[PDB]
Design an enzyme around this catalytic site. Structure first.
Site, PDB file in Angstrom:
ATOM      1  N   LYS A  34      -9.479  17.245 -11.574  1.00 61.08           N
ATOM      2  CA  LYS A  34      -8.337  17.090 -10.679  1.00 61.08           C
ATOM      3  C   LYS A  34      -7.365  18.255 -10.803  1.00 61.08           C
ATOM      4  O   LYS A  34      -6.884  18.775  -9.791  1.00 61.08           O
ATOM      5  CB  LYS A  34      -7.634  15.766 -10.971  1.00 61.08           C
ATOM      6  N   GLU A  41       4.314  10.194 -15.546  1.00 57.28           N
ATOM      7  CA  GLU A  41       3.037  10.301 -16.234  1.00 57.28           C
ATOM      8  C   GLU A  41       3.252  10.783 -17.662  1.00 57.28           C
ATOM      9  O   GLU A  41       4.385  10.947 -18.126  1.00 57.28           O
ATOM     10  CB  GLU A  41       2.072  11.214 -15.471  1.00 57.28           C
ATOM     11  N   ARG A  42       2.135  10.993 -18.353  1.00 54.65           N
ATOM     12  CA  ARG A  42       2.145  11.297 -19.776  1.00 54.65           C
ATOM     13  C   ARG A  42       2.719  12.685 -20.024  1.00 54.65           C
ATOM     14  O   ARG A  42       2.445  13.628 -19.280  1.00 54.65           O
ATOM     15  CB  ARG A  42       0.723  11.193 -20.318  1.00 54.65           C
TER      16      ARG A  42
END
Ligand SMILES: Nc1ncnc2c1ncn2[C@@H]1O[C@H](COP(=O)(O)OP(=O)(O)OP(=O)(O)O)[C@@H](O)[C@H]1O
Ligand SMILES: [Mg+2]
Lengths: 175, 51, 358, 355, 143, 143, 118, 118
Positions: D164, D190-191
């Site tokens: 991705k 997100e992380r």
């Protein structure tokens, strides 16, 4: 849910009136505030108007409610700044129901076919003061042409009915 | 049939009885109660006082 | 101990110092603004459903008339509306500008011109909440509404005056069926109305362009309320479409009205009712969610010859999930519309276009 | 004066009371700069976004950082606008948080720079593009099987070691090479170590000099993660409006936008819609993605990652993302094991433009 | 193993805020050695119980509930916890904080709210199936 | 729609002190006690998430700051806490004792020794609500 | 008393501790608490733990506790059986198919597990 | 009027008596009532008992009422169809599975019962 809140407010003002020693002045001020707000209903709609600032509404209450004592005015301004000024007649009813128990007087509503004499009402108060427990008792007499040949009394939430109770008890016992 | 007779009999009775109440009140009004109202009242307090 | 007459007369002079400064009857001030729902103190002479206007210029809908305040649903951007803003009445109950000079224009659910071709000069207005034709005011449908699609005009025929559902999943050709049946009405005596409810405004732009290429903007009206618009405007888009159609209906002419995705209207009214803190039913739609679509689609009728004989054929859309025809909003609309046209994704992804499950 | 003070603090929700007639409008930014007077206080630099008007001259706000240490009566200044976020050539090659403040360690942006508001209405019907034109990427699976659209929204179904980030990075390189535009990466909720890995990948590939990166991570409140895609989008809007060019705008896991809005709705005290999502789900997704359009002078095309929770495509957050998607590109691990790079599944990837 | 470990205990008889503040005491005792350049492992046995304790505190404090009556900031709670597990750079000292949170599932479903939250926060997961634990496979790791 | 602060004891002293409010600002009296949750009138300068102390020595944490009371979450046994107890602001955000001396000891989330092996001789404390290391303050996981 | 004074290894049988939690859920709705997940009181884990942590073996004596558990509709995922199970150390499952066979006690050997079988 | 004053056989055809309870549910939220299961009024049983227990045959005359009853989202366990089974002498349960097979009337032969079948 307004009576339980007005009971708290009136009990606070009641304890202030006991510890201060000016209970007659606070009672007269509360009666004056109740009569002035019963005679004028647009004052709540004026103080509910939101464009008026809180300082201006405090100025209106400090100007209008002048001559009354200091904790009554502090109570009105505290109800203003807590937005609980709509329950001031309920506060007056609860505070007068507290100070009537403080004096030891009770209010009663009498219905009779004929208007009784001034001595008979004092005799009824002297009888019923031992039954209720108060030292002084008040009788309110209404003309009331429905009941025939007797007296009925509603004191507190208890009805002493013996006027037309004979005929209704008879037609309930026969049939 | 036996139930029917017993129910009609109670009903009619109730109509006569109803009439009798309405009048009982009317006739008591009819009497002159200057003496009676003072007498009744004095008795009523006394009567309340006892119960 | 003060006399009550003194306090009473002083309260009287304080009131009649301020009786002329304040104005409450036709002028209101806002208590709360939030999520497109205002709530205003004042407005004693406002009536239920009346258009109110804020100081910003944004219009509002007075749903609730409580004892202390007025509940106002804001018909536009609510970010310019604050507590303390002035609300004034308009005098009219929830009207859109409706006339002959509205044909060929792209307007919002408030009738304001969106396409930027100038103002829309109209002389009449019709109420949004108008009653449907009665039992004896109607007539059996006997005239063909011909779409130009062979599978519809053969298998699932639509008459002038009925309510035909076009139901299906995502990307099954519902809007294509709508534009194919709006384009065909050119030489026929039919005025179309395409109501875009919660669409992408780029797709509404391409819809207006493909109507302009085929000459369809000589007889069609586009009422658009896209996804970025607040849910009050999404709530009043199909009612704006039917209030624009009733003019030509009760003048004796025939109108086609297309509702692109009424499920977006159901989700928007579900949003507005949850922001009004109303207790919801199944799939969290409120209990009024059947009356929302039934008050809409029963206003589409075939009038009798005593009322002109005009009609209002309606093509609502319901976007389903995974072909579930037994969901809550599809079975609400199926029990309102006369027939349904089911567009199947199994046939659409295999090349069978239009993918009508017969 | 436009300085009011805090009345209530409950988690991320802070109620602030101003004077009458001087309340801030909805969605404005409110700054709390407080220096600790005593040893019994905490230095506070905190930013609030106006959410509601509760009445009695009060304002209910949501927080962008932690509310730990706030005192009732601490003064709050009104900025007079929503969150002003810098735009232009000063944002390219730079990493920002949700407030438009540089996370990077080189320097801060001076106060004379142009800053655009976050909350802007979508571009009008007058201003949109009449035609549908194709955003040429240079990737053969994309340009042949699932064509992208200038102004379109595109879903990435993939992640966890399929490619991705490489596809993201080659898209930035190809668009900034041939079409002359830029890209904006908005990492929404997100992380943080994956954001670090993505930063260093864009750094050592040279791609980062033509992109502007915005990160609001998991440690931030839901009121911060709800506004990350909007503060990257307001950077992309400058390049399609004032420069007039075709701009990429990447939103890693658009599902985090939906659930952050759900958490803000639950904190604000609203009655939840079906599946626990906010009532305003479709209109928040619309107010994000109706500003991602092709206008007359430029466009924003958007490649978005979607999680599809519980593998359910009828779940309301996938069901409201999918009504705006114009194409779908599906990354498959069986093609990455085979040696095919990019790993786009040729049969599962569909597009609306393939017509 | 007690020559190098710290044990932070908040049992079921303890009040719900101690249950709520045990993991934050864990990271507050780990970040000392993390910012001194050392490497720390922090283990959270049943963060689902910490989530239930914060649900209890928010419901008794009358905060507006969300799914399964957990408040709106329960994902913010576990994310604000678990994002403090980092690998620092060489300018910050190079220390680390590796975290091993536990979430207890009920009859082996991970579609519940707290398991989906803590799965979506962490850097991968290890399933321990009771089906493999019963059949003899110990440790019962579903590969 | 009754408020929490409408108590005839509190309303009495605010009508006594309307022209000159007694500025408590560091001390509060409990309104409601229940389930490990205490509402307290007063504490005008209390912070959110602050360690606060009751009259019997039991600690508490102030989570909800409301308009005229503080939602205090009791960090210990609450059965000895009645209405009317004084609540003393300690002036410190929730923090734990922190150092080398915690290694090999069983500790509660407040930082007190639970082994009974003696006091924990730490020098400095750090707050349990601390920001995570930033995305430019980290490094890729390789050890 | 027997544990802390006599120093004995005491048994303590609680029949259907599910009723100890659902009685709390019946009271807590009327006490004025917000409902928790699945209709159970919000303070369910603490009210369970204040029961289950007094059942311990100290240095003086011991209290071991065999506790019957009724699981409603054999749903092991609702919160009150989950918090009863999180305090359990062993289960003994009484099976009707072994009682009809003539095996007394009818403890199912495969389904009855223990933490101590190590 | 007909079955009492004239003593005459009366046919009632009512199409969608579900809309009675649904129109009650639309007003019940605004009447100040708390919601019940599935968003229906708390009085979902007694509002339909004041209507449907009144549609009876007496010694004077009879009413044979034939009522169509909408089933929302094809859910027979919905509280408004489930509480009106107890009022009916004979029920015919139409199914969509039989209507999609071309079987008309799409009456479920098993779930349709009557008091007459004896
Ligand atoms: N009969 C047809 N022949 C060929 N192509 C068609 C036909 N009908 C529709 N299409 C194509 O299918 C595409 C998608 O159809 P359409 O957008 O009308 O479906 P939709 O239900 O409106 O989608 P959405 O629900 O997402 O708005 C269109 O771009 C159109 O080009
Ligand atoms: Mg469409």
């Amino acid at each position: 849910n307004q009576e339980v809140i007005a009971k708290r407010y009136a009990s606070a003002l009641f304890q202030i009136a006991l510890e201060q020693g000016q209970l007659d002045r606070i009672e007269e001020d509360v009666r004056a505030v109740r009569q002035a707000l019963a005679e004028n209903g647009e004052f709540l709609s004026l103080l509910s108007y939101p464009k008026l600032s809180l300082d201006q509404k405090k100025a209106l209450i400090a100007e209008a409610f002048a001559g009354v004592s200091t904790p009554v005015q502090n109570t009105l301004l505290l109800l203003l700044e807590r937005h609980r000024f709509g329950l001031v007649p309920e506060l007056a009813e609860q505070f007068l129901a507290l100070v009537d128990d403080a004096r030891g007087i009770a209010k009663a509503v009498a219905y009779s076919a004929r208007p009784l004499t001034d001595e008979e009402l004092r005799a009824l108060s002297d009888v019923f003061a031992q039954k209720v427990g108060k030292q002084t008792l008040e009788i309110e007499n209404i003309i009331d042409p429905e009941l025939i040949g007797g007296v009925r009394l509603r004191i507190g939430n208890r009805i002493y009915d013996g006027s037309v109770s004979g005929q209704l008890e008879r037609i309930r016992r026969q049939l | 049939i036996e139930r029917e007779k017993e129910q009609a009999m109670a009903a009619l009775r109730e109509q006569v009885a109803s009439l009798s109440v309405l009048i009982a009140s009317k006739v008591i009004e009819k009497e002159l109660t200057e003496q009676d109202q003072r007498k009744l009242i004095e008795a009523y307090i006394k009567d309340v006082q006892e119960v | 101990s003060i006399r009550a007459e003194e306090i009473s007369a002083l309260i009287k002079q304080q009131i009649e110092n301020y009786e002329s400064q304040i104005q409450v009857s036709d002028v209101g001030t806002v208590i709360q603004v939030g999520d497109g729902i205002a709530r205003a103190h004042g407005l004693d002479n406002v009536m239920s459903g009346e258009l109110v206007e804020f100081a910003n210029g944004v219009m509002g809908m007075a749903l609730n008339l409580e004892e202390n305040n007025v509940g106002i649903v804001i018909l536009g951007p609510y970010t310019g509306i604050k507590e303390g803003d002035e609300v004034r009445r308009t005098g009219r109950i929830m009207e859109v500008p409706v006339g002959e000079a509205l044909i060929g224009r792209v307007v919002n659910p408030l009738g304001q011109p969106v396409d930027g071709l100038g103002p829309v000069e109209t002389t009449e207005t019709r109420p949004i909440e108008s009653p449907a034709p009665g039992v004896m005011d109607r007539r059996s449908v006997h005239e063909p509404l011909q779409t130009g699609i062979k599978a519809i005009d053969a298998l699932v025929p639509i008459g002038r005056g009925q309510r035909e559902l076009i139901i299906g999943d995502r990307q099954t050709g519902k809007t294509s069926v709508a534009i194919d049946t709006i384009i065909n009405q050119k030489d026929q005596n039919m005025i179309s109305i395409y109501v875009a409810i919660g669409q992408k405004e780029s797709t509404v732009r391409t819809v207006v362009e493909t109507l302009r290429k085929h000459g369809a903007l000589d007889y069609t009206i586009v009422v658009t309320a896209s996804a970025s618009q607040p849910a009050p405007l999404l709530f009043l888009a199909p009612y704006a479409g039917v209030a624009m159609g009733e003019y030509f209906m009760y003048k004796g002419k025939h109108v086609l009205v297309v509702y692109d995705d009424l499920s977006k209207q159901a989700a928007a009214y579900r949003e507005l009712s949850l922001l009004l803190r109303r207790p919801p039913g199944r799939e969290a739609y409120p209990g009024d969610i059947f009356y929302l679509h039934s008050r809409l689609l029963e206003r589409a009728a075939k009038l009798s010859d005593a009322k002109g004989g005009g009609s209002l054929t309606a093509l609502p859309f319901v976007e389903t999930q995974a072909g579930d025809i037994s969901a809550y909003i599809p079975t609400n609309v199926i029990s309102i519309t006369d027939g349904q046209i089911f567009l199947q994704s199994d046939l659409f992804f295999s090349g069978v276009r239009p993918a009508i499950n017969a | 004066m436009t300085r009011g003070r805090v009345i209530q603090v409950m988690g991320p929700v802070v109620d602030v009371k101003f004077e009458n007639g001087h309340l801030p409008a909805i969605y404005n930014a409110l700054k709390i700069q407080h220096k600790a007077r005593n040893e019994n206080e905490v230095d506070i630099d905190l930013t609030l976004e106006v959410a509601l008007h509760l009445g009695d001259d009060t304002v209910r706000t949501i927080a962008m950082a932690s509310t730990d240490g706030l005192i009732r009566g601490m003064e709050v200044i009104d900025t007079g606008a929503p969150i002003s976020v810098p735009v232009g050539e000063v944002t390219l090659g730079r990493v920002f948080n949700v407030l438009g403040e540089p996370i990077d360690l080189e320097g801060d942006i001076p106060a004379d720079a142009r800053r655009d508001p976050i909350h802007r209405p979508a571009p009008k019907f007058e201003e949109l593009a009449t035609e549908v034109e194709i955003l040429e990427t240079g990737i053969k699976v994309v340009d042949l099987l699932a064509p992208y659209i200038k102004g379109g929204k595109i879903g990435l179904f993939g992640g966890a070691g399929v490619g991705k980030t490489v596809l993201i990075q080659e898209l930035i390189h190809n668009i900034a090479q041939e079409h002359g535009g830029i890209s904006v990466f908005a990492g929404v909720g997100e992380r943080t170590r994956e954001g670090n890995d993505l930063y260093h990948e864009m750094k050592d590939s040279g791609v980062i000099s033509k992109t502007a990166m915005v990160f609001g991570q998991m440690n931030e409140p839901p009121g911060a993660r709800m506004r990350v895609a909007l503060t990257g989008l307001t950077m992309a809007e400058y390049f399609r409006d004032e420069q007039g060019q075709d701009v990429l705008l990447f939103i890693d896991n658009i599902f985090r936008f939906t659930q952050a809005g759900s958490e803000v709705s639950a904190l604000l005290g609203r009655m939840p819609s079906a599946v626990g999502y906010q009532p305003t789900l479709a209109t928040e997704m619309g107010q994000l993605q109706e500003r991602i359009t092709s206008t007359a002078k430029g466009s924003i095309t958007s490649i978005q990652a979607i999680y599809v929770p519980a593998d359910d495509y009828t779940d309301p957050a996938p069901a409201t993302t999918f009504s705006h998607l114009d194409a779908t590109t599906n990354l498959e691990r069986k093609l990455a094991e085979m040696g095919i790079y990019p790993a786009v599944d040729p049969l599962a990837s569909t597009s609306r433009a393939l017509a």
